[PDB]
């Protein structure tokens, strides 16, 4: 039965529509869902708008009337201008009439705010179409009708709020530049009269709901109106006194005063400065007398979450921070405003203690502004000494782990400034907090962790002498805390915190070799501790200290027999014996950092030799037995050992880069033999077991070997300084071992990592291997394209790596594309346009960049057959493909680079930089310029694609695009204007003259 | 769970097999517990999701059940369960459970068989 | 004790994936765009008894928008979702908020930045400020890693019940029934188990 309403050959049964709507909003499961589908199809019926007037009159369901207005809104915003004037006036009148009628009934006005607000927004959609040009007395009649009734006056304030929002706040994306300027100027020209209604209601009104709606409209007006409406009327006084006393108006009033604080205001006017001070004084006086005193526990109030207390305290933080960030200098020099200044900051100290992460960040941004200013501005810090002392405790008690990168950074910067301002106060707070860990009063894992992070954060702020005393004191206290504590859990928490603190004071470690050596040896002891987290923190602290203090490991320290790097390498088997593979890799990586400090080549190469001794000997043993009998790779255990050898090589190559070459040279030949052997096993296994083989632990392990070998080579070549060796020694064996294997595996067995490795090769030495680049394209291009051109989802990594490779080949070795046979060059253009149509931002952006780079590469060839053939074959393909993704609404993320590409293509023809006619002979008179033909081609293409546009709209748009094709920002404005006009009927063609 | 002894506890990800969609669908991640009822000495699997603590497995470790390897994993078990009540009404499922390591999966199988022998008495 | 919750935000931000994970525990890797709205009851067990959300998971894509703001009518709470890997999805948050609060003037709303599991984050912490003036709760979330997975619902439950000390609790676990195998479905179980053993488990590279 419910599907009856979709039958438009009948008259609509409103009793039925009301059933469907009720079963959707109030019903359940199966029937809620099928009602949903019926309502959607009803609403989207392009004749459904004809039914709206009937539904609004005869429906008893305010939800049906809401959906009716949704249907009408689709008509108003998209097809309005096709209606005869009489019909548009008909609709305007039945919307206004319905609004007034709903407002004049008290019961309806109270209980149906949803339908009234929706009606008001529908009215504003009509105003955007009709006002003022076809409705000049709208604002006068609204102002007039406001005296008639308190409900109509209140609702008129909702209409004016929505109008201001639609014109000033949300016009940028929804209207042409011209239409936005027209509506902004129209509201501006009539605001004097709107303001007088607003002001009179605030001065004399007694309805709380009327006053609140008036202040809600004022909040929107404050985004755009001139300051004089606020500073040259009584309105500042009313907002900052009367409306702050009433809780009903307080929330919206605070939000208004925040926006008042952001008004553009004269800067050299003592009266205006006094008014700015006065409204702040009034506001804070009302808070202290009507809401809570400066001493109030806002942490407690906020936690209790009574009524609107949380939103109010959020709004107070926003108001104080906004006002003080702009105006605190007004309060700083006059001794009579000192109490106001410090009371405002005291409210902010109390707000900063609230347990609410996002509110804390708001206050922290302000504290950063303040303490940065106290650090640089003369004669200011002394004002804020008690505020800063309190803030030191708040920041230390709220310190987060450095893993929370933005919050830790903000907190550290604030605490560093505060420490500089008073190092004695900072130290005293941190040492007394440590004492409350030691006496058990504040002891917990979270609390010792928090304090450790705070202590670490201020490294570098103290003098070296003060830091030395401070660090020794902290380390002594944490060592005593560890001894005192019972159980492995407790001891491990404090031990992690000692190693965290030590890791953050490299200046101290570099001055105290004996202590640094002790710390490293204790970290080595910890690398045998199986207690969860200890081995990880030992390895993490090791590499962190090495990164900061590497030089102290590579020199011979006084009273040592050799550089400490030799001592580490000589005992590495024992040190690393109990570590997991990833921990071993970190350890080897840290050793590589130290070895790369040794700038004597002989000594560096010997340390590298000695570090790689264990993996090299395990490698040699495997190679000897893997060559003597190829079966032993079957052993899952051997595959894991090989993978971990290669990963150890990657880790050391990561830290040594160019210096790694001799180690890569030692393994290179057998590494590529292993790549080929593993490759055979994978191909064989997939044949014997099916595609499922690629999910088996065995094949995944074999593919790990291939991926890690590609990662090792990519890592080395990305950092290589000797590119002659890369080309003469590494490239040919690499391309031989990896390209044919990639091409000749089934899609599911191809490693995306091959494409990634080849991107680095072309990036670093592409200019030196033109024949190698051609071989790379021959091996990967067509087979990879065929994997990714059936849909946008399959082989996501291949898709991304494929376009990164094409991008670098197009940048470094364009000649490789010149060598493609025509059919493959066509596939290249196809692949670029395919990248355009991705939603995936990585692929989309590379697609558009390749297109721009290709056009530039063709431009450089000058007037030669290949360039002329390119333009004749592909210019219109690139123009039309680019327009398609610009206008289809499915590729908004790529707008900038789409606009850039289109501007490049249009400017080529505008300048006459294409030497041949782009048109086929007999298509136009044989003399005709490419400018004339391009204009005709685009007019025809846009007319076919957007048949609802007029010829004049398309001609005016294209005339603007042509003129603006050397001015990106304006060109983009014109494109955005076109994107607005294609979404509606009867767009004004003069919009494209906007200047 | 207050009337039960905790015999074994391991972090796991549980899947159920969708025959319709021919694919494994995750049911939960969190602590998988073998709970021995102090009254009946019957051992159940009880698994709760991280964060929400909602039940993703609640069934007797039936002596008739057999842990089989999954083609994809050296750290997972697949078994038929004829009566799981995680989501209310007893339902039959093909479960897969995956662990942090092969050692954890091997240890799970060991405890699961120990529980089966307890449930046989 | 049921509350209407409306989920809004750009297509592909992870609204349906987030809800589905909460409903069944599953992580849907495929993107199947919602058509208009999907309504699912979602129950949490609290120290103050059960709370039921009637989740109206709405379409983010304009071409699948259906009734659009028609879905928001009599919502008691809301989640606005964006994707921290897609800047445009954050740029659109004020548009979703606008359409939402015009229909729901005084409801608790959580802003959720989804997909924080992805290394290449595009919407930086420092950029995310829209919530402050609009009094929205904000959470970084991952429907994939379960990062802050329960936080949006815990926050809304506290606001709707008006108890800031409300906690999610463990639903106590009934003794499961003992079973006997049906010898008629022995052959059936052999087949289903063969099919399941030879279908690979997803994400074999994850930590679980
Ligand atoms: N990496 C990652 N992917 C996610 C996450 N959440 C969702 N996804 C994926 O992102 C895509 C978005 O899925 P949906 O939930 O269907 O998107 P939606 O917001 O419901 O979109 P519409 O229904 O069109 O409005 C899917 O492929 C999900 O698997 C997340 O936290 N991390
Ligand atoms: C990891 C825990 C379970 C047990 C650890 N208990 C002992 C560790 C203490 S604690 O880590 C500690 C002990 C010493 C000590 F050698 F001087 F004692 C020195 C340091 C160093 F090197 F950082 F200065 C640190
Ligand atoms: Cl200032
Ligand atoms: Cl503790
Ligand atoms: Cl140094
Ligand atoms: Cl030497
Ligand atoms: Cl755009
Ligand atoms: Cl249209
Ligand atoms: Cl069985
Ligand atoms: Cl549920
Ligand atoms: Cl906030
Ligand atoms: Mg969805």
PDB file of N, CA and C in Angstrom, chain A residues 289-344:
ATOM      1  N   UNK A 289      30.083  38.340  40.403  1.00  0.00           N
ATOM      2  CA  UNK A 289      28.937  38.689  41.282  1.00  0.00           C
ATOM      3  C   UNK A 289      27.762  37.735  41.027  1.00  0.00           C
ATOM      4  N   UNK A 290      27.539  37.299  39.781  1.00  0.00           N
ATOM      5  CA  UNK A 290      26.336  36.522  39.367  1.00  0.00           C
ATOM      6  C   UNK A 290      26.632  35.035  39.129  1.00  0.00           C
ATOM      7  N   UNK A 291      27.884  34.630  38.912  1.00  0.00           N
ATOM      8  CA  UNK A 291      28.165  33.217  38.519  1.00  0.00           C
ATOM      9  C   UNK A 291      29.106  32.559  39.520  1.00  0.00           C
ATOM     10  N   UNK A 292      30.360  32.980  39.601  1.00  0.00           N
ATOM     11  CA  UNK A 292      31.299  32.412  40.593  1.00  0.00           C
ATOM     12  C   UNK A 292      32.437  33.394  40.816  1.00  0.00           C
ATOM     13  N   UNK A 293      32.983  33.459  42.043  1.00  0.00           N
ATOM     14  CA  UNK A 293      34.156  34.284  42.311  1.00  0.00           C
ATOM     15  C   UNK A 293      35.439  33.702  41.699  1.00  0.00           C
ATOM     16  N   UNK A 294      36.482  34.528  41.702  1.00  0.00           N
ATOM     17  CA  UNK A 294      37.805  34.226  41.092  1.00  0.00           C
ATOM     18  C   UNK A 294      38.383  32.958  41.737  1.00  0.00           C
ATOM     19  N   UNK A 295      38.067  32.708  43.002  1.00  0.00           N
ATOM     20  CA  UNK A 295      38.611  31.581  43.803  1.00  0.00           C
ATOM     21  C   UNK A 295      37.878  30.265  43.511  1.00  0.00           C
ATOM     22  N   UNK A 296      36.760  30.280  42.788  1.00  0.00           N
ATOM     23  CA  UNK A 296      35.866  29.111  42.615  1.00  0.00           C
ATOM     24  C   UNK A 296      36.635  27.947  41.967  1.00  0.00           C
ATOM     25  N   UNK A 297      36.334  26.727  42.407  1.00  0.00           N
ATOM     26  CA  UNK A 297      36.945  25.473  41.896  1.00  0.00           C
ATOM     27  C   UNK A 297      36.221  25.081  40.599  1.00  0.00           C
ATOM     28  N   UNK A 298      36.700  25.553  39.453  1.00  0.00           N
ATOM     29  CA  UNK A 298      36.028  25.314  38.151  1.00  0.00           C
ATOM     30  C   UNK A 298      36.254  23.850  37.733  1.00  0.00           C
ATOM     31  N   UNK A 299      37.347  23.237  38.174  1.00  0.00           N
ATOM     32  CA  UNK A 299      37.643  21.807  37.899  1.00  0.00           C
ATOM     33  C   UNK A 299      36.485  20.985  38.468  1.00  0.00           C
ATOM     34  N   UNK A 300      36.104  21.260  39.720  1.00  0.00           N
ATOM     35  CA  UNK A 300      34.981  20.606  40.431  1.00  0.00           C
ATOM     36  C   UNK A 300      33.650  20.903  39.724  1.00  0.00           C
ATOM     37  N   UNK A 301      33.332  22.172  39.454  1.00  0.00           N
ATOM     38  CA  UNK A 301      32.066  22.570  38.785  1.00  0.00           C
ATOM     39  C   UNK A 301      31.954  21.842  37.433  1.00  0.00           C
ATOM     40  N   UNK A 302      32.991  21.926  36.609  1.00  0.00           N
ATOM     41  CA  UNK A 302      32.988  21.343  35.243  1.00  0.00           C
ATOM     42  C   UNK A 302      32.728  19.836  35.349  1.00  0.00           C
ATOM     43  N   UNK A 303      33.438  19.144  36.246  1.00  0.00           N
ATOM     44  CA  UNK A 303      33.339  17.681  36.457  1.00  0.00           C
ATOM     45  C   UNK A 303      31.885  17.323  36.781  1.00  0.00           C
ATOM     46  N   UNK A 304      31.200  18.173  37.561  1.00  0.00           N
ATOM     47  CA  UNK A 304      29.824  17.941  38.073  1.00  0.00           C
ATOM     48  C   UNK A 304      28.807  18.051  36.939  1.00  0.00           C
ATOM     49  N   UNK A 305      29.093  18.854  35.911  1.00  0.00           N
ATOM     50  CA  UNK A 305      28.370  18.867  34.613  1.00  0.00           C
ATOM     51  C   UNK A 305      26.893  19.226  34.817  1.00  0.00           C
ATOM     52  N   UNK A 306      26.576  20.053  35.818  1.00  0.00           N
ATOM     53  CA  UNK A 306      25.192  20.544  36.059  1.00  0.00           C
ATOM     54  C   UNK A 306      24.782  21.453  34.898  1.00  0.00           C
ATOM     55  N   UNK A 307      23.549  21.294  34.401  1.00  0.00           N
ATOM     56  CA  UNK A 307      22.968  22.129  33.332  1.00  0.00           C
ATOM     57  C   UNK A 307      24.003  22.494  32.279  1.00  0.00           C
ATOM     58  N   UNK A 308      24.112  23.785  31.941  1.00  0.00           N
ATOM     59  CA  UNK A 308      24.926  24.273  30.795  1.00  0.00           C
ATOM     60  C   UNK A 308      26.281  24.780  31.294  1.00  0.00           C
ATOM     61  N   UNK A 309      26.726  24.324  32.464  1.00  0.00           N
ATOM     62  CA  UNK A 309      27.954  24.806  33.150  1.00  0.00           C
ATOM     63  C   UNK A 309      29.174  24.535  32.262  1.00  0.00           C
ATOM     64  N   UNK A 310      29.252  23.354  31.638  1.00  0.00           N
ATOM     65  CA  UNK A 310      30.437  22.975  30.821  1.00  0.00           C
ATOM     66  C   UNK A 310      30.556  23.932  29.626  1.00  0.00           C
ATOM     67  N   UNK A 311      29.479  24.120  28.858  1.00  0.00           N
ATOM     68  CA  UNK A 311      29.443  25.042  27.694  1.00  0.00           C
ATOM     69  C   UNK A 311      29.782  26.467  28.142  1.00  0.00           C
ATOM     70  N   UNK A 312      29.237  26.907  29.277  1.00  0.00           N
ATOM     71  CA  UNK A 312      29.491  28.274  29.792  1.00  0.00           C
ATOM     72  C   UNK A 312      30.986  28.454  30.090  1.00  0.00           C
ATOM     73  N   UNK A 313      31.608  27.483  30.763  1.00  0.00           N
ATOM     74  CA  UNK A 313      33.044  27.556  31.146  1.00  0.00           C
ATOM     75  C   UNK A 313      33.918  27.476  29.880  1.00  0.00           C
ATOM     76  N   UNK A 314      33.548  26.646  28.906  1.00  0.00           N
ATOM     77  CA  UNK A 314      34.195  26.639  27.563  1.00  0.00           C
ATOM     78  C   UNK A 314      34.113  28.047  26.956  1.00  0.00           C
ATOM     79  N   UNK A 315      32.918  28.638  26.939  1.00  0.00           N
ATOM     80  CA  UNK A 315      32.711  29.978  26.329  1.00  0.00           C
ATOM     81  C   UNK A 315      33.510  31.035  27.105  1.00  0.00           C
ATOM     82  N   UNK A 316      33.643  30.887  28.417  1.00  0.00           N
ATOM     83  CA  UNK A 316      34.395  31.870  29.232  1.00  0.00           C
ATOM     84  C   UNK A 316      35.871  31.798  28.855  1.00  0.00           C
ATOM     85  N   UNK A 317      36.418  30.585  28.702  1.00  0.00           N
ATOM     86  CA  UNK A 317      37.816  30.373  28.275  1.00  0.00           C
ATOM     87  C   UNK A 317      38.012  31.039  26.909  1.00  0.00           C
ATOM     88  N   UNK A 318      37.086  30.814  25.977  1.00  0.00           N
ATOM     89  CA  UNK A 318      37.180  31.391  24.611  1.00  0.00           C
ATOM     90  C   UNK A 318      37.165  32.917  24.715  1.00  0.00           C
ATOM     91  N   UNK A 319      36.277  33.468  25.542  1.00  0.00           N
ATOM     92  CA  UNK A 319      36.145  34.941  25.689  1.00  0.00           C
ATOM     93  C   UNK A 319      37.431  35.530  26.272  1.00  0.00           C
ATOM     94  N   UNK A 320      37.870  35.034  27.428  1.00  0.00           N
ATOM     95  CA  UNK A 320      39.090  35.567  28.101  1.00  0.00           C
ATOM     96  C   UNK A 320      40.305  35.444  27.173  1.00  0.00           C
ATOM     97  N   UNK A 321      40.553  34.267  26.593  1.00  0.00           N
ATOM     98  CA  UNK A 321      41.759  34.057  25.743  1.00  0.00           C
ATOM     99  C   UNK A 321      41.690  34.996  24.527  1.00  0.00           C
ATOM    100  N   UNK A 322      40.528  35.095  23.871  1.00  0.00           N
ATOM    101  CA  UNK A 322      40.359  35.948  22.666  1.00  0.00           C
ATOM    102  C   UNK A 322      40.634  37.398  23.068  1.00  0.00           C
ATOM    103  N   UNK A 323      39.960  37.875  24.109  1.00  0.00           N
ATOM    104  CA  UNK A 323      40.089  39.288  24.526  1.00  0.00           C
ATOM    105  C   UNK A 323      41.545  39.559  24.926  1.00  0.00           C
ATOM    106  N   UNK A 324      42.122  38.734  25.793  1.00  0.00           N
ATOM    107  CA  UNK A 324      43.457  39.031  26.379  1.00  0.00           C
ATOM    108  C   UNK A 324      44.545  38.915  25.300  1.00  0.00           C
ATOM    109  N   UNK A 325      44.414  37.978  24.351  1.00  0.00           N
ATOM    110  CA  UNK A 325      45.399  37.823  23.255  1.00  0.00           C
ATOM    111  C   UNK A 325      45.487  39.141  22.480  1.00  0.00           C
ATOM    112  N   UNK A 326      44.379  39.861  22.334  1.00  0.00           N
ATOM    113  CA  UNK A 326      44.351  41.128  21.571  1.00  0.00           C
ATOM    114  C   UNK A 326      44.599  42.353  22.466  1.00  0.00           C
ATOM    115  N   UNK A 327      44.115  42.371  23.720  1.00  0.00           N
ATOM    116  CA  UNK A 327      43.919  43.643  24.470  1.00  0.00           C
ATOM    117  C   UNK A 327      44.669  43.693  25.805  1.00  0.00           C
ATOM    118  N   UNK A 328      45.414  42.665  26.213  1.00  0.00           N
ATOM    119  CA  UNK A 328      45.937  42.679  27.605  1.00  0.00           C
ATOM    120  C   UNK A 328      46.878  43.881  27.789  1.00  0.00           C
ATOM    121  N   UNK A 329      47.558  44.343  26.734  1.00  0.00           N
ATOM    122  CA  UNK A 329      48.441  45.533  26.784  1.00  0.00           C
ATOM    123  C   UNK A 329      47.643  46.765  27.251  1.00  0.00           C
ATOM    124  N   UNK A 330      46.349  46.863  26.924  1.00  0.00           N
ATOM    125  CA  UNK A 330      45.463  47.957  27.411  1.00  0.00           C
ATOM    126  C   UNK A 330      45.418  47.946  28.940  1.00  0.00           C
ATOM    127  N   UNK A 331      45.522  46.764  29.555  1.00  0.00           N
ATOM    128  CA  UNK A 331      45.322  46.584  31.017  1.00  0.00           C
ATOM    129  C   UNK A 331      46.636  46.650  31.799  1.00  0.00           C
ATOM    130  N   UNK A 332      47.795  46.717  31.141  1.00  0.00           N
ATOM    131  CA  UNK A 332      49.103  46.402  31.782  1.00  0.00           C
ATOM    132  C   UNK A 332      49.799  47.625  32.404  1.00  0.00           C
ATOM    133  N   UNK A 333      49.572  48.841  31.908  1.00  0.00           N
ATOM    134  CA  UNK A 333      50.346  50.047  32.329  1.00  0.00           C
ATOM    135  C   UNK A 333      49.578  50.890  33.364  1.00  0.00           C
ATOM    136  N   UNK A 334      48.246  50.840  33.352  1.00  0.00           N
ATOM    137  CA  UNK A 334      47.370  51.585  34.292  1.00  0.00           C
ATOM    138  C   UNK A 334      47.233  50.785  35.595  1.00  0.00           C
ATOM    139  N   UNK A 335      47.723  51.316  36.719  1.00  0.00           N
ATOM    140  CA  UNK A 335      47.760  50.584  38.017  1.00  0.00           C
ATOM    141  C   UNK A 335      46.334  50.274  38.488  1.00  0.00           C
ATOM    142  N   UNK A 336      45.350  51.058  38.043  1.00  0.00           N
ATOM    143  CA  UNK A 336      43.921  50.903  38.413  1.00  0.00           C
ATOM    144  C   UNK A 336      43.292  49.711  37.668  1.00  0.00           C
ATOM    145  N   UNK A 337      43.936  49.193  36.616  1.00  0.00           N
ATOM    146  CA  UNK A 337      43.404  48.032  35.847  1.00  0.00           C
ATOM    147  C   UNK A 337      44.185  46.767  36.189  1.00  0.00           C
ATOM    148  N   UNK A 338      45.136  46.845  37.122  1.00  0.00           N
ATOM    149  CA  UNK A 338      46.010  45.704  37.480  1.00  0.00           C
ATOM    150  C   UNK A 338      45.152  44.565  38.045  1.00  0.00           C
ATOM    151  N   UNK A 339      44.219  44.873  38.954  1.00  0.00           N
ATOM    152  CA  UNK A 339      43.357  43.848  39.607  1.00  0.00           C
ATOM    153  C   UNK A 339      42.510  43.138  38.540  1.00  0.00           C
ATOM    154  N   UNK A 340      41.913  43.889  37.611  1.00  0.00           N
ATOM    155  CA  UNK A 340      41.139  43.322  36.477  1.00  0.00           C
ATOM    156  C   UNK A 340      42.029  42.364  35.672  1.00  0.00           C
ATOM    157  N   UNK A 341      43.222  42.818  35.306  1.00  0.00           N
ATOM    158  CA  UNK A 341      44.166  42.022  34.491  1.00  0.00           C
ATOM    159  C   UNK A 341      44.464  40.700  35.200  1.00  0.00           C
ATOM    160  N   UNK A 342      44.813  40.748  36.482  1.00  0.00           N
ATOM    161  CA  UNK A 342      45.240  39.540  37.217  1.00  0.00           C
ATOM    162  C   UNK A 342      44.024  38.662  37.534  1.00  0.00           C
ATOM    163  N   UNK A 343      42.850  39.246  37.772  1.00  0.00           N
ATOM    164  CA  UNK A 343      41.619  38.451  38.032  1.00  0.00           C
ATOM    165  C   UNK A 343      41.247  37.663  36.772  1.00  0.00           C
ATOM    166  N   UNK A 344      41.295  38.286  35.599  1.00  0.00           N
ATOM    167  CA  UNK A 344      41.020  37.621  34.302  1.00  0.00           C
ATOM    168  C   UNK A 344      41.975  36.430  34.114  1.00  0.00           C
TER     169      UNK A 344
END
